[PDB]
Design a protein around this nucleic acid. Sequence first.
DNA 1: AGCAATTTAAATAGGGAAGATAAGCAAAGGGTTGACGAAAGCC
Length: 60
Amino acid sequence: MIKEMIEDFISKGGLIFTHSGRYTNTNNSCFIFNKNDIGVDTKVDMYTPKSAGIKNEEGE
DNA sequence: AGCAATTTAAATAGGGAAGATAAGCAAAGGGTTGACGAAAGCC
């Protein structure tokens, strides 16, 4: 399910971003979602504390 | 005690043999490098 997942994300810290300083330093935790660069094939990152979240029936 | 000459021509061709093989092993390791969240003494 998808809504189940979006809400699983929201019960947790719940951040969706396209740019971050988390890659520069893992202790940083700055997450920035730019609106202008979202396109058809724009890959999009998300953050949860310790990457928490349930999987589906196909294990994703 | 330096003086030692000039031109001219330097071979055309025919051949550079194929047949064989070119190992099989067994190794090639992991040891550290984790930030948030949550109890839990402690100024």
